[PDB]
Structure 1
Amino acid sequence: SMLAELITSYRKSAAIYAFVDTGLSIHFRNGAYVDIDELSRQCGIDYSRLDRLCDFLIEIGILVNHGHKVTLSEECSALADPESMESLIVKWELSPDCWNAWSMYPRSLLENDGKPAFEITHGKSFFEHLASNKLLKSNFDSSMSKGSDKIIEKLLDIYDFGQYNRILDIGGGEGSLLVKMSEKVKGKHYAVLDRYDEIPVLENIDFINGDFLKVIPSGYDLYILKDVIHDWSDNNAILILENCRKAMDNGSAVLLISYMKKPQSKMVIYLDILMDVLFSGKERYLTEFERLANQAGLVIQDVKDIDESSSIIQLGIK
């Protein structure tokens, strides 16, 4: 039934985490025809239990049965590459720390405090937890960097970044967006603000150990907030945009690169539940973004659609 399939949906995700995390997936790269007996003795997993996992992976369409050989479906080929966005997302999103948080989602809905499901579980915010668990932070940061690679060409096609001399990436993490921006747009001062215990060093990009909740550094032509605002409540979102305005001089711009809530925007609705559970954030309509900006003393000057589910918002003062 439809109800039975929705109830058991989680098993498909759990099996994919197993397929990637155990190291099974890497044996399926380049559409290789894999023998499960060889796979069992290579990866050191009991043949019977691996053969049973493979039957489930075949059933849900991850693997394809060729008779006496199994292959990774072309649609799911990214799982074979451990550095792929999808593989890295699987390794942090479906890891115990994030997976187990969903257990406390019902409690978080009833508590009527400020604490998300992830905070109830770990007694820490998501980013506070990442500071104490390097491997989880590495997989998160890397997946985000891989995410930036997918949209950078479109961004550079739809928006003129070359008109700005000094560009700061607020919560830019590894600084992947600006590293890739540098390859086309040359001769600019590029900085990235984020919470670093060890400050990363690249030459062509500067890095600042900062806190955008308290203060944002002044003297930049462009301030970028990519997938930052959706991590935060309305008051903290205003606090970041406020701190942006306080550091701004007229002629300077803020660019928001964000997922956009629309009526029946499937991918964004799916994402919105994760943002509640993991970050206590939310996906927002353009109308909501405008009010957050207006409250912070900023005005929307232009909106351009990257995707059917994401946009860039240019902000100024007045």
Structure 2
Amino acid sequence: SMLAELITSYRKSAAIYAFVDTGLSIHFRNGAYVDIDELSRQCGIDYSRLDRLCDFLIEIGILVNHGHKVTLSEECSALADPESMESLMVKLELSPDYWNAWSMYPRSLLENDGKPAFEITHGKSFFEHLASNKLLKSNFDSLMSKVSDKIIEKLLDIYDFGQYNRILDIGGGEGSLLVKMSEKVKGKHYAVLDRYDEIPVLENIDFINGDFLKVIPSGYDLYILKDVIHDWSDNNAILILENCRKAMDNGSAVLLISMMKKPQSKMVIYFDILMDVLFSGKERYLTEFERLANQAGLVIQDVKDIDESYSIIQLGIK
């Protein structure tokens, strides 16, 4: 039935995580035909249990049966590529620390404490936990870097970054966006503000240890907020934008690089629930960004689409 298939959906995601996390996926590179017997011996997995997992992966369309051999479906080739967006998503969002948060989503909904499912599960915030977990931070950084790679060319095409001399990436993390921007836009002062244990050093990028909820440094022409605002409640988002305005002088701009909810959104609605589970965050309509900005003596000057999900929103002082 439709309902039965929806209820048991999670088993498909868990099986794909096992396929990658156990190292099975490595053996399926370049459309290779794989003997399950030899695969069991290579990976140190019980033959019968591996054969049953392969039968499940065949049923859901990940693998294709070829008698005594199996192959990765050409539609799913990305699972054999560790640097593919899909492989990076599997290694991050299906990891135990993420997975286990979802079973506390109902409790979080009834609590009305503001505490997200992830915090109920782990007893600390997502970024507090990420700072304490080397492997999760590595998987997170790898995905962030891949997203930077995916959008950078379209971003440089639709927005003139050349007009700004001093650019601060607010919550820029490992700074992959400005790294890829500095490859094509030259002779600029690039800075990244985030929370660092050890301040990363990188030629052409100044890294600043700070807190954007308290203060943002003045003297920058462009302030960038990529995938930051959607982590926060309305009041905390307004606080960040108020702190941007306080840092800004006449002529300066804020550029939000954000998913945007739209009437015809499907992927964004799907992603919005993950933001609730991890952050008590949310994806916002343009009209919601309008109000947030207004409250911070800022105003939307322009909006452009990168793709189906991501838009850029230029703010100026109100």
> TM-score, normalization: structure 1?
0.97
- Alpha-carbon distance between aligned partners in 2 of 1:67 and 1:60, rounded to the nearest angstrom: 17
- Alpha-carbon distance between aligned partners in 1 of 2:76 and 2:188, rounded to the nearest angstrom: 39
Alpha-carbon deviation of 1:197?
Answer: 0.5
Alpha-carbon deviation of 1:3?
Answer: 0.1
Alpha-carbon deviation of 1:47?
Answer: 0.9
Alpha-carbon deviation of 1:87?
Answer: 1.7
Aligned residues: 318
Q: How does 1:207-218 map to 2 (within 5 A)?
A: 207-218=207-218
- Alpha-carbon distance between aligned partners in 2 of 1:76 and 1:185, rounded to the nearest angstrom: 36
Q: Is the CA contact 1:259–1:309 (under 8 Å) kept in the aligned structure 2?
A: yes
- Alpha-carbon distance between aligned partners in 1 of 2:270 and 2:73, rounded to the nearest angstrom: 24
- Alpha-carbon distance between aligned partners in 2 of 1:31 and 1:207, rounded to the nearest angstrom: 42
Q: Is the CA contact 1:84–1:143 (under 8 Å) kept in the aligned structure 2?
A: no
Alpha-carbon deviation of 1:97?
Answer: 1.0
Runs of at least 5 residues in structure 1 that lack an aligned partner in the other structure: none
Runs of at least 5 residues in structure 2 that lack an aligned partner in the other structure: none
- Alpha-carbon distance between aligned partners in 1 of 2:253 and 2:74, rounded to the nearest angstrom: 42
Aligned residue number for residue 135 of structure 1: 135
What are the superposed Cα offsets for residues 176-231 of structure 1, whole Å, 9 maximum, x if unpaired? 11111111111111111111111111101121111111111111111110111001
Structure 1 position 267 matched with structure 2 position 267: yes
- Alpha-carbon distance between aligned partners in 2 of 1:68 and 1:156, rounded to the nearest angstrom: 50
What are the superposed Cα offsets for residues 19-58 of structure 1, whole Å, 9 maximum, x if unpaired? 1111111111122221111111111111111111111111
Alpha-carbon deviation of 1:309?
Answer: 2.3
> TM-score, normalization: structure 2?
0.97
- Alpha-carbon distance between aligned partners in 2 of 1:105 and 1:132, rounded to the nearest angstrom: 23
TM-aligned CA distance change 1:200 to 1:237, over 3 Å: same
- Alpha-carbon distance between aligned partners in 2 of 1:194 and 1:71, rounded to the nearest angstrom: 43
What are the superposed Cα offsets for residues 231-289 of structure 1, whole Å, 9 maximum, x if unpaired? 10001100111111111111111000111111241100110000000111001000000
Aligned residue number for residue 60 of structure 2: 60
Q: Is the CA contact 1:173–1:194 (under 8 Å) kept in the aligned structure 2?
A: yes
Alpha-carbon deviation of 1:84?
Answer: 2.6
- Alpha-carbon distance between aligned partners in 2 of 1:166 and 1:157, rounded to the nearest angstrom: 19
SS of 1:313's partner is strand
Greater alpha carbon shift after TM alignment, 216-225 vs 2-11: 216-225
- Alpha-carbon distance between aligned partners in 2 of 1:69 and 1:290, rounded to the nearest angstrom: 56
Aligned residue number for residue 316 of structure 2: 316
Q: Is the CA contact 1:86–1:143 (under 8 Å) kept in the aligned structure 2?
A: no
SS of 1:131's partner is helix
- Alpha-carbon distance between aligned partners in 2 of 1:44 and 1:175, rounded to the nearest angstrom: 39
Greater alpha carbon shift after TM alignment, 182-191 vs 229-238: 182-191
Structure 1 position 108 matched with structure 2 position 120: no
SS of 2:163's partner is coil
SS of 2:301's partner is strand
- Identical columns (%): 97
Structure 1 position 76 matched with structure 2 position 76: yes
Alpha-carbon deviation of 1:137?
Answer: 1.0
Greater alpha carbon shift after TM alignment, 259-268 vs 281-290: 259-268
- Alpha-carbon distance between aligned partners in 2 of 1:58 and 1:160, rounded to the nearest angstrom: 48
Greater alpha carbon shift after TM alignment, 80-89 vs 201-210: 80-89
Alpha-carbon deviation of 1:9?
Answer: 0.3
SS of 1:41's partner is helix
Alpha-carbon deviation of 1:110?
Answer: 0.5
Q: Is the CA contact 1:33–1:70 (under 8 Å) kept in the aligned structure 2?
A: yes
- Alpha-carbon distance between aligned partners in 2 of 1:224 and 1:76, rounded to the nearest angstrom: 35
Aligned-residue RMSD, C-alpha: 1.1
Q: Is the CA contact 1:257–1:310 (under 8 Å) kept in the aligned structure 2?
A: yes
